[PDB]
Design an enzyme around this catalytic site. Structure first.
Site, PDB file in Angstrom:
ATOM      1  N   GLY A  30      -2.239  -3.909  -7.185  1.00  0.00           N
ATOM      2  CA  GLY A  30      -1.744  -5.036  -6.333  1.00  0.00           C
ATOM      3  C   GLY A  30      -1.657  -6.306  -6.970  1.00  0.00           C
ATOM      4  O   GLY A  30      -1.958  -6.466  -8.126  1.00  0.00           O
ATOM      5  N   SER A  66      -2.602  -3.777  -3.149  1.00  0.00           N
ATOM      6  CA  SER A  66      -3.158  -2.879  -3.492  1.00  0.00           C
ATOM      7  C   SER A  66      -4.156  -2.366  -2.137  1.00  0.00           C
ATOM      8  O   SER A  66      -4.915  -3.409  -1.704  1.00  0.00           O
ATOM      9  CB  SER A  66      -4.052  -2.696  -4.622  1.00  0.00           C
ATOM     10  OG  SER A  66      -4.729  -1.375  -4.920  1.00  0.00           O
ATOM     11  N   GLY A  67      -4.240  -1.075  -1.705  1.00  0.00           N
ATOM     12  CA  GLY A  67      -5.223  -0.598  -0.782  1.00  0.00           C
ATOM     13  C   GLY A  67      -4.378  -1.254   0.358  1.00  0.00           C
ATOM     14  O   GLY A  67      -5.228  -1.126   1.698  1.00  0.00           O
ATOM     15  N   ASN A  79     -10.941  -8.143  -4.077  1.00  0.00           N
ATOM     16  CA  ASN A  79     -10.277  -7.107  -3.478  1.00  0.00           C
ATOM     17  C   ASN A  79     -11.052  -5.843  -3.438  1.00  0.00           C
ATOM     18  O   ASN A  79     -11.361  -5.363  -4.465  1.00  0.00           O
ATOM     19  CB  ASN A  79      -8.690  -6.719  -3.601  1.00  0.00           C
ATOM     20  CG  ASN A  79      -8.251  -6.404  -2.437  1.00  0.00           C
ATOM     21  OD1 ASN A  79      -7.738  -6.651  -1.386  1.00  0.00           O
ATOM     22  ND2 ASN A  79      -8.245  -4.883  -2.354  1.00  0.00           N
ATOM     23  N   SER A 135      -8.682  -2.093  -4.282  1.00  0.00           N
ATOM     24  CA  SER A 135      -7.603  -2.652  -5.179  1.00  0.00           C
ATOM     25  C   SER A 135      -7.427  -1.564  -6.242  1.00  0.00           C
ATOM     26  O   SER A 135      -8.208  -1.477  -7.435  1.00  0.00           O
ATOM     27  CB  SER A 135      -8.139  -3.960  -6.117  1.00  0.00           C
ATOM     28  OG  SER A 135      -7.473  -4.326  -6.808  1.00  0.00           O
ATOM     29  N   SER A 136      -6.626  -0.488  -6.008  1.00  0.00           N
ATOM     30  CA  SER A 136      -6.552   0.380  -6.897  1.00  0.00           C
ATOM     31  C   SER A 136      -6.002  -0.147  -7.997  1.00  0.00           C
ATOM     32  O   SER A 136      -5.459  -1.480  -8.190  1.00  0.00           O
ATOM     33  CB  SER A 136      -5.272   1.485  -6.366  1.00  0.00           C
ATOM     34  OG  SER A 136      -5.801   2.032  -5.383  1.00  0.00           O
ATOM     35  N   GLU A 143      -3.181  -9.889  -7.788  1.00  0.00           N
ATOM     36  CA  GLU A 143      -4.520 -10.712  -7.803  1.00  0.00           C
ATOM     37  C   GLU A 143      -4.417 -11.606  -8.773  1.00  0.00           C
ATOM     38  O   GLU A 143      -4.029 -11.612  -9.819  1.00  0.00           O
ATOM     39  CB  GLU A 143      -5.598  -9.627  -8.114  1.00  0.00           C
ATOM     40  CG  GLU A 143      -5.667  -8.865  -9.407  1.00  0.00           C
ATOM     41  CD  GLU A 143      -6.635  -8.072  -9.895  1.00  0.00           C
ATOM     42  OE1 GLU A 143      -7.470  -7.960  -9.140  1.00  0.00           O
ATOM     43  OE2 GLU A 143      -6.593  -7.509 -11.023  1.00  0.00           O
ATOM     44  N   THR A 202      -0.597   4.947   1.492  1.00  0.00           N
ATOM     45  CA  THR A 202      -1.040   5.494   2.662  1.00  0.00           C
ATOM     46  C   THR A 202      -0.542   5.130   4.148  1.00  0.00           C
ATOM     47  O   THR A 202      -0.785   5.877   5.065  1.00  0.00           O
ATOM     48  CB  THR A 202      -2.761   5.204   2.744  1.00  0.00           C
ATOM     49  OG1 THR A 202      -2.798   3.790   3.002  1.00  0.00           O
ATOM     50  CG2 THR A 202      -3.252   5.252   1.231  1.00  0.00           C
TER      51      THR A 202
END
Length: 689
Positions: free
Chosen positions: A381, A95-96, A146, A149-150, A383, A100
């Protein structure tokens, strides 16, 4: 010398990693694999995403220019450009870490190749690139480990026009981790949009909202025990958020109109009722002691503070003949009391987010023209803490589908394309469809099947639920415990569970109120009967394309969010994109050995390399072997027969080469053992410079 990735000087496992580093260390970002895309993340603005590099990837093939376009899309995504059909793409890789940056790719390849002219076309190509800072606020939220971390299951759909350019789109979300707002692990935080609002406004406006300058005074914020942080600037972000809203299409006039809705929830949120000495012995019900808080909940609603609690805390039911008559009700226990408390304060947000993103599109969406639709995926993501909990199970469950997704697509759907293209194909052994983790949680007698079994036994706690799993299984693969498997690592109140390539021990804390969360219509009816664009506004014009049947005990409700996801995957032509996070320091040139190797392993990518093909050393595509080794043997000219087997036999027989050493399938040459490669290449050198 050697283009593409399937022509390595040494096709060994070690060289694979060593070259991967050298690639990234030689202006080579993306990497191919039998038509599979892998990428990395710079974690900063890299001057490579604009006009200049786009002109390079325009009107060329894969075997010509560096990794970026992969011809498969050009021979699939474009294949349905003339055949007039829909498309969809999936992305993953922590994530992140840009899903993007990975999405950035899809666009800049689409445009230019698409069209131009329209001045409103190059402008919208700027706002979508300015959506990166925008999307970095909504979906993203800081976790304990993180930062970017969406945490959400988003499936964005890009709509288009009749010429081949975007016009708008809609957003869809699955079951939300709706406990994030009120409950969480110490040190972590909820969504940023909230904290950036409390310290960005003026006390004068805060009073209008009904907020007092005192964080500990609240509860939802008290449960965390942290507010002011040195790292992130609070007052500096607010003004940036306003720009983002104003730039898109949310003027202050509209902002204020929306804040009333959010401020209303805050009033109905800050109410964790106290002990109600109504019973006799030890048990108890619920009653208000901090009245001004519950009064605030009804303040925005402007209704009889008391009457409000008569229908909520107390469950009223009659029905029969006509349909229901509300007044007589039941003082429920604490467990069901705090249950409805959460179900209420959490459901309103799910409806809000959906209505928030959708009503925004109402302004952004194009009315000038219509067109097809293409989907894009983005999720949280991977984790792993030294400890674990309930939330870890559900997140890992989402991955179980993502892994199964590829299996259903890159291993199954694509495998069916082999016989559709008219190729001499013979079923090669592929690792089982791991139905041991699927059948164990669908049909009667299953995990989620027994999970709903224990949860509905209201009195049964999470601890007792654990024992309900062991007895039913502890024999079916991929499930262990401290009782059967003698491993001290497992606690007396924890359990073992296998996934892909490793072990994860979960905790039992939560589960109950964390899972069910269901909300009935006996608490909504009394509220939607009001007359106020805010009160009834919380409940948009009845059923936003998601109802069919409203009252259903959780369990099933979660299945819907996951079933609606699958039903729309077995009827479309998808595309796959992977991503690998470099390191935990945003460095575009640093390797964390142990961390990287692990990322490549739990995804099972190198196994998808060997198994897919079959499982051996040197491999080359026929489609690419033909148009490459043409000027070597005779009778391999336009006067060819057609078959890729008889032709090759005609080739290798004139130069004395055993036939069993080579075999024909889909589009991959199979010669066992490495030495033969060095034997082939050299033989092509000592008799022809």
């Amino acid at each position: 010398g050697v283009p593409d990735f399937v022509l390595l000087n040494q096709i060994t496992e070690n060289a694979f990693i060593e070259n991967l580093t050298m690639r990234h260390k030689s202006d080579n970002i993306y990497t191919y694999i039998g038509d599979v895309v892998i990428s990395t993340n710079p974690f900063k603005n890299l001057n490579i995403y604009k006009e200049s590099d786009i002109k390079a990837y325009n009107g060329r093939y894969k075997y010509e220019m560096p990794p970026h376009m992969y011809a498969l899309a050009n021979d699939a995504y474009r294949s349905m450009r003339q055949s007039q059909e829909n498309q969809c793409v999936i992305i993953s890789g922590e994530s992140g870490a840009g899903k993007t940056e990975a999405s950035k790719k899809i666009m800049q390849f689409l445009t230019f190749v698409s069209s131009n002219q329209s001045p409103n076309g190059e402008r919208i190509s700027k706002m979508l690139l300015d959506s990166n800072p925008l999307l970095e606020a909504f979906g993203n939220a800081k976790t304990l480990r993180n930062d970017n971390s969406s945490r959400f299951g988003k499936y964005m759909e890009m709509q288009f026009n009749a010429v081949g350019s975007p016009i708008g789109g809609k957003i869809t979300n699955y079951l939300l981790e709706k406990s994030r707002v009120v409950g969480r692990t110490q040190g972590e935080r909820s969504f940023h949009i909230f904290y950036q609002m409390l310290k960005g406004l003026s006390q004068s406006k805060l009073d209008e909202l009904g907020l007092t300058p005192n964080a500990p005074a609240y509860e939802y914020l008290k449960k965390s025990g942290c507010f002011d942080v040195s790292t992130i600037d609070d007052s500096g972000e607010f003004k940036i958020i306003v720009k983002a809203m104003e730039t898109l299409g949310l003027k202050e006039s509209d902002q204020n109109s929306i804040w009333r809705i959010l401020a209303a929830i805050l009033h109905i949120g800050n109410i964790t009722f106290a002990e109600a000495a109504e019973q006799r012995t030890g048990t108890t019900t619920v009653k208000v002691s901090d009245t001004k808080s519950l009064a605030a909940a009804a303040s925005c609603l402007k209704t009889d503070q008391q009457s409000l609690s008569i229908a909520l805390c107390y469950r009223s039911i009659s029905t029969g003949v006509g349909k229901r008559c509300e007044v007589i009700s039941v003082p429920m226990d604490c467990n069901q009391a705090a249950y409805s408390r959460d179900a209420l304060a959490k459901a309103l947000y799910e409806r809000l987010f959906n209505w928030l993103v959708s009503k925004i599109n109402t302004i952004i969406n194009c009315t000038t023209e219509k067109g097809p639709v293409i989907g894009i995926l983005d999720i949280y993501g991977f984790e792993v803490f030294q400890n674990n909990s309930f939330e870890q199970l559900n997140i890992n469950f989402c991955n179980e589908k993502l892994q199964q997704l590829f299996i259903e697509l890159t291993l199954k759907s694509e495998q069916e394309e082999y016989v559709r293209e008219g190729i001499e194909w013979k079923n090669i052994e592929y690792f089982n469809n791991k139905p041991i983790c699927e059948l164990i949680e669908k049909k009667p007698i299953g995990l989620i099947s027994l999970l709903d079994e224990a949860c509905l036994i209201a009195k049964s706690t999470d601890q007792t639920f654990l024992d309900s799993i062991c007895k039913q299984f502890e024999k079916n693969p991929h499930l262990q415990s401290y009782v059967v498997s003698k491993d001290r690592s497992i606690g007396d109140t924890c359990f073992r569970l296998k996934h892909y390539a490793g072990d994860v021990t979960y905790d039992v804390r939560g589960f109950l109120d964390k899972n069910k969360d269901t909300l009935f219509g006996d608490l909504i009816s009394s509220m939607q009967s009001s007359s106020d664009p805010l009160v009834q506004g919380l409940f948009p014009p009845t059923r936003p394309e998601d109802s069919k049947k409203r009252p259903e005990t959780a369990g099933s409700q979660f299945r819907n969010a996951m079933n609606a996801l699958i039903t729309t995957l077995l009827a479309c032509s998808p595309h796959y994109v992977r991503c690998i996070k470099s390191n935990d320091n945003k460095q575009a040139g640093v390797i964390d050995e142990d961390r990287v190797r692990h990322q490549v392993r739990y995804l099972g990518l190198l196994e998808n390399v060997r198994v897919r093909r079959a499982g051996f050393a040197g491999r080359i595509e026929y489609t690419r072997f033909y148009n490459r080794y043409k000027m070597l043997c005779k009778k391999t000219w336009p006067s060819f027969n057609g078959t890729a087997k008889q032709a090759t036999e005609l080739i290798l027989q004139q130069h004395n080469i055993d036939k069993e050493e080579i075999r024909m399938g889909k589009t991959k040459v199979f010669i066992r053992n490495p030495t033969t490669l060095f034997y082939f290449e050299e033989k092509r050198e000592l008799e022809m410079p």
